[PDB]
């Protein structure tokens, strides 16, 4: 536990201690993305406490040393399953949001590339496919996270939604987002327009952009979605995926592209694929490189004690032997300091 | 002096099939392909049909050599199950013991 709640002052001195996110900030900045199990824990406890760690502090120092004049640099948080990459990305997202950044956050790319009942054909490009439901979902999440910047940011082009309906240069980005949401048919197109406008305006310096993409390995992998002829679909055929790759490019400046690999839900990948190349594949490695790889691993004994004491204080560990050092040692044995295994045991312990 | 007229018929079928095998082989190769004219394959079909019915290998049955039983014949010994059991239980078959594991 730390008294410091501002995400710009805390550093290594706070290592091994929880950092609280207020409910209002959780709602605004993080209406999505956060792991389902941590969401259940937050619902149970009324406390969104993430222990600060070297990975998150490192990437915060990276973003403080970043020069927006530089073309946006890529960072890649990689590791095994349940090492907390998602929560580190969320922590840094909170930092940038409190720093007034525009957070272009992708909660998970695995969802975008599977189980898409609504798969129409993009009007803007008849050779691609749209995912109106997911487009609307992410548009709503982005609006929730950056409503303030939504109005402040204007468009710089004419965008035709129908033969008679269009949006005009200089209009606020709110008009585009509203069109995408209400007119779900235009959802993917609005997502692409938003990505383009945010990229160009970050280049112009209207704000500072953090492109925080979770499970980035999905983009350059494979897809299970099948055409009306049952043919397989490659990722580029998904306008969302192609636009997200365009964003993953570093050609633009005015921000940084942070990403976090995630095997959870990955397609055709064996359970043990956790290395950057093994996940991204040749195409993904080639697209991301250059990148700064940051490892996320199990807990150390200090952070293990911090997590256990957090659960004990919250009384989550309602069993009698949980405070006992023997129970602590058994938890360490079973979870090998793995955050996800530890929590998935503590849930019924 | 075969066991029965059915075994003798089978022997005749075997001899006829062996004699006419190559002609049957080539005619069947001609018939089963998608290159030659359909008229060519039709003339081949009538030729194969005109070839003696008994020459067809399908009409060859694996009757027991020693009793001409039409069913339950082990292909490795060509003997009916009854005769195989008799010999095995009399120990006349090398290396074949009884069943216990």
């Amino acid at each position: 536990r730390t008294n410091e709640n501002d995400p710009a002052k805390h550093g290594d001195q706070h290592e091994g201690q929880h950092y609280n996110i207020s409910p209002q900030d959780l709602e605004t900045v993080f209406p999505h993305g956060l792991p389902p199990r941590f969401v259940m824990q937050v619902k149970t406890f009324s406390e969104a406490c993430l222990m600060v760690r070297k990975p998150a502090l490192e990437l915060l120092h990276y973003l403080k040393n970043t020069s927006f004049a530089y073309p946006a640099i890529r960072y890649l948080l990689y590791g095994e399953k349940g090492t907390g990459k998602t929560l580190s990305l969320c922590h840094v997202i909170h930092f940038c949001a409190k720093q007034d950044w525009l957070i272009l956050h992708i909660p998970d790319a695995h969802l975008w590339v599977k189980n898409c009942r609504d798969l129409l054909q993009s009007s803007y490009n008849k050779q691609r496919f749209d995912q109106p439901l997911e487009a609307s979902t992410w548009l709503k999440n982005f609006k929730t996270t950056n409503e303030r910047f939504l109005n402040q940011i204007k468009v710089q082009e004419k965008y035709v939604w129908n033969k008679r309906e269009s949006t005009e240069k200089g209009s606020p980005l709110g008009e585009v987002v509203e069109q995408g949401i209400t007119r779900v048919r235009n959802a993917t197109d609005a997502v692409g327009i938003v990505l383009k406008e945010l990229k160009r305006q970050s280049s112009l310096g209207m704000f500072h952009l953090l492109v925080a993409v979770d499970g980035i390995n999905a983009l350059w992998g494979r897809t299970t979605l099948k055409r009306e002829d049952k043919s397989p679909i490659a990722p580029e055929e998904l306008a969302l995926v192609h636009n997200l790759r365009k964003m993953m490019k570093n050609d633009w400046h005015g921000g940084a592209i942070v990403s976090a690999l995630s095997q959870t839900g990955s397609l055709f990948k064996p359970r043990k694929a956790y290395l950057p190349q093994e996940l991204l594949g040749k195409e993904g490695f080639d697209a991301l490189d250059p990148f700064i790889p940051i490892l996320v691993s199990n807990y150390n004994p200090k952070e293990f004690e911090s997590c256990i004491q957090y659960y004990l204080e919250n009384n989550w560990l309602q069993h009698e032997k949980a405070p006992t050092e023997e129970g602590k040692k058994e938890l360490l044995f079973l979870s090998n300091a793995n955050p996800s295994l530890l929590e998935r045991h503590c849930a019924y312990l | 002096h075969y066991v029965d007229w059915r075994m003798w018929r089978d022997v005749k079928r075997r001899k006829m099939a062996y004699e006419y095998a190559d002609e049957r082989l080539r005619i069947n190769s001609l018939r089963k392909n998608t290159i030659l004219p359909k008229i060519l394959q039709d003339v081949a079909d009538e030729e194969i049909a005109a070839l003696p019915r008994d020459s067809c290998p399908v009409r060859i049955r694996n009757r027991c050599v020693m009793t001409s039983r039409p069913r339950g014949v082990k292909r490795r010994w060509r003997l009916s199950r009854i005769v195989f059991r008799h010999l095995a239980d009399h120990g006349q078959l090398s290396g074949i013991q009884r069943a216990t594991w």
């Binding site: 359970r271 044995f333 079973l334 090998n336 | 594991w101």
Partner: protein
């Protein structure tokens, strides 16, 4: 006492059950009659009498001590090397135990011996397993680890493990299907 067949062979004679009972009762009376050495020697001619092997502690090139053992379950075989000192690491087929055994039941099987002797985190283990299903592999690794740990735990601890069942090879193996019945005991649906 020696069984009736043993006595029959000893006497190269054919006895009866009542004959054996008479002889055994007379012998029992001879016991109870303060049989001295000169008599106990004769009696022991009719008596019949009714521990896990401690493997050597070998050493590596670096001089670190360890003990190697093996064990088989169903169709699985496991060779386990347990080091005198270790931080509880248990590498299976070059893989971490939790990764290799994605089932908490198998993890508990692995933990059972070391938990029983309260030596968790005091030994580093390398287990190479082969053959059989997941549960068979878990059982084989557990047996091998228990045997290897015997060398490092005291004799009383070894006896306690053996009593518990850690050190006893499992004789339960699949029973072969029998002809004319679906399973080893499943008789085909009784027609009528």
């Amino acid at each position: 006492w020696l069984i009736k067949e043993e006595l029959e062979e000893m006497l190269v004679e054919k006895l009866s059950d009542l004959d054996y009972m008479q002889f055994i009762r007379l012998l029992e009376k001879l016991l109870t009659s303060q049989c001295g050495a000169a008599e106990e020697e004769f009696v022991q001619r009719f008596r019949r009498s009714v521990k896990q092997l401690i493997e050597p502690v070998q050493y590596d090139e670096q001089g670190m001590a360890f003990s190697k053992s093996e064990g088989k379950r169903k169709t699985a075989k496991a060779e386990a090397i347990v080091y005198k000192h270790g931080s509880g690491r248990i590498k299976v087929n070059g893989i971490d135990y939790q990764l290799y055994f994605p089932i908490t039941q198998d993890r508990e099987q692995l933990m059972f011996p070391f938990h029983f002797v309260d030596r968790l985190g005091k030994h580093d283990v390398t287990c190479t397993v082969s053959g059989g299903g997941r549960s068979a592999q878990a059982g084989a690794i557990r047996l091998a680890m228990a045997k290897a740990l015997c060398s490092f735990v005291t004799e009383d601890e070894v006896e306690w493990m053996r009593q518990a069942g850690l050190l006893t090879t499992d004789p339960r193996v699949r029973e072969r299907k029998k002809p004319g019945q679906e399973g080893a005991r499943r008789k085909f649906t009784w027609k009528k």
